[PDB]
């Protein structure tokens, strides 16, 4: 099968920032990739449109995906309240890596993070499932609104999102 | 040595509701019981005075102790960020049992729950460290401000706390 | 993020011997680097300034970091009493390797050692987290105050410390 590409249109406080597209590695982690694709299209009745990036730490990552509580305590997968850690084939090799946030082994829901650096200490604890295809400059722009403890100064929102291929 | 006894004066919004006193089983879980006792006196410079019970589910338990984020994502022990599950000798045997809340094994901080029912499905996963000595009637009164999801209707506060014996 | 550089200004009783700088591998062991870094600036209220290297064995290592008991039975981390062994990605590859001393698995506090030789027999038991950037000759000078039992001949002291980069 061919790997899907999803996009996010980011908006800082209302103003459009730009678009990030991501390649989802369905050829390595199909169930994890499908969860993200489906929450991006919004085809199951919920997903990421309108959710915000609740925690951004410059030179580390931008964490988002909590469309239910918007603060890191929620989110859900299309498979249920949580799903298994599919496998750990891909590693946190550089900036632009998309990986699952979790609350310990096998608690995957909807929260994810985009690495702005290589985060190899996280290898084997978080499932890597995608990479930024276009728009790294928008992620780099997003970084600038975060602080050492993660609070953003402006509301970074996924204004729209969906699938491209 | 002797088992300490601490008290909590509960206030619904601002009105005094009453006192609950607890025996802490320092003779079974000395490190877990010293943590709670010190956070109740505030002797290490921080603790439960002023915090709230953020999650109350009637017929189950009252949860509190998050004096940093006040919503369930914080708290800390006198030993650091988190500490080890001391042992699982004692069981959740009925109403009045005071036990540690956590985020999986060995993440004890300061959050606790007072059981308003026997919760044996929690045995072996949460460390039991005390029991209500007096004021079980006040705990039953607190229950009434909860709901099935745990959100309260009034802010239940530990207006005061300290050691007795 | 970027790897911190910290410095120590070593004093042998009176006269300054010199400055050793260290690169801390925050790209491999972020939680262990931040501990040394924060304890070197002293930003959290306590730290390394004024402590001594209490055990130096020539041709093996210089050990210091016990700022509370000064003899090897103390120290504490910014995270508390002790903290986990983060990972053992890095090995003890040669002189000027900076690694955590411990009292067995997951008992890291503040004590560390500066290797003056390749200690590979310690791989897997001690978390390596930094390397002497500039200043190896000052460490080689410190060496000559030890003995096979670790006794220092003169009072080696970290006169000042902080973060460069």
């Amino acid at each position: 099968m061919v790997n899907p590409t999803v996009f996010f249109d980011i908006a800082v406080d209302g103003e459009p920032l730009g678009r990030v597209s991501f390649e989802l590695f369905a050829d390595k982690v199909p169930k994890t990739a499908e969860n993200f694709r489906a929450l991006s299209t919004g085809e199951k009745g919920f997903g990421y449109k309108g959710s915000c990036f609740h925690r951004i730490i410059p030179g580390f990552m931008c964490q988002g995906g909590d469309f239910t509580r918007h603060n890191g305590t929620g989110g859900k997968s299309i498979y249920g309240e949580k799903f298994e850690d599919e496998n750990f084939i891909l590693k946190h090799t550089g900036p632009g890596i998309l990986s699952m946030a979790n609350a310990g082994p096998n608690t995957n829901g909807s929260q994810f993070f985009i690495c702005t650096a290589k985060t190899e200490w996280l290898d084997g604890k978080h499932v890597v499932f995608g990479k930024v295809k276009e728009g790294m400059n928008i992620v780099e722009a997003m970084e600038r609104f975060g602080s050492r403890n993660g609070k953003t100064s402006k509301k970074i929102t996924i204004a729209d999102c969906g699938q491209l291929e | 040595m002797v088992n300490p006894t601490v008290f909590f004066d509960i206030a619904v919004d601002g009105e005094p509701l009453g006192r609950v006193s607890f025996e802490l089983f320092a003779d079974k879980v000395p490190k877990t019981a010293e943590n709670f006792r010190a956070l109740s006196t505030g002797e290490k410079g921080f603790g439960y005075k002023g915090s709230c019970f953020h999650r109350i589910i009637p017929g189950f338990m009252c949860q509190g102790g998050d004096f940093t984020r006040h919503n369930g994502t914080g708290g800390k022990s006198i030993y650091g960020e988190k500490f080890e599950d001391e042992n699982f000798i004692l069981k959740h045997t009925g109403p009045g049992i005071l036990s540690m809340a956590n985020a999986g094994p060995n993440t004890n901080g300061s959050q606790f729950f007072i059981c308003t029912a026997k919760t044996e499905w929690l045995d072996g996963k949460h460390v039991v460290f005390g029991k209500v000595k007096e004021g079980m009637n006040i705990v039953e009164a607190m229950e009434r401000f909860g709901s099935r999801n745990g959100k309260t209707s009034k802010k239940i506060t530990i207006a005061d706390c300290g050691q007795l014996e | 993020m970027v790897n911190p550089t910290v410095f120590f200004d070593i004093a042998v009783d009176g006269e300054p011997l010199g400055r050793v700088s260290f690169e801390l591998f925050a790209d491999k062991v972020p939680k262990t680097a931040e501990n040394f870094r924060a304890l070197s600036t002293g930003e959290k209220g306590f730290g390394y300034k004024g402590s001594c290297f209490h055990r130096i064995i020539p041709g093996f290592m210089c050990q210091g970091g016990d700022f509370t008991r000064h003899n090897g039975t103390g120290g504490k981390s910014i995270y508390g009493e002790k903290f986990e062994d983060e990972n053992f990605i890095l090995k003890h590859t040669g002189p000027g390797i900076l690694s955590m001393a411990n009292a067995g698995p997951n008992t890291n506090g503040s004590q560390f050692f500066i290797c003056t030789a390749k200690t590979e027999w310690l791989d897997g038991k001690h978390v390596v987290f930094g390397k002497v950037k500039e200043g190896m000759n000052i460490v080689e000078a410190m060496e000559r105050f030890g003995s096979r039992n670790g006794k220092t001949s003169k009072k080696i002291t970290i006169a000042d410390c902080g973060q460069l980069e």
């Binding site: - | - | 972020p30 931040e34 910014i78």
Partner: peptide
């Protein structure tokens, strides 16, 4: 420290 968890965030 530098971790990414959902709910109890540690150092």
């Amino acid at each position: 420290x530098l971790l990414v968890x959902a709910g109890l965030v540690l150092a």
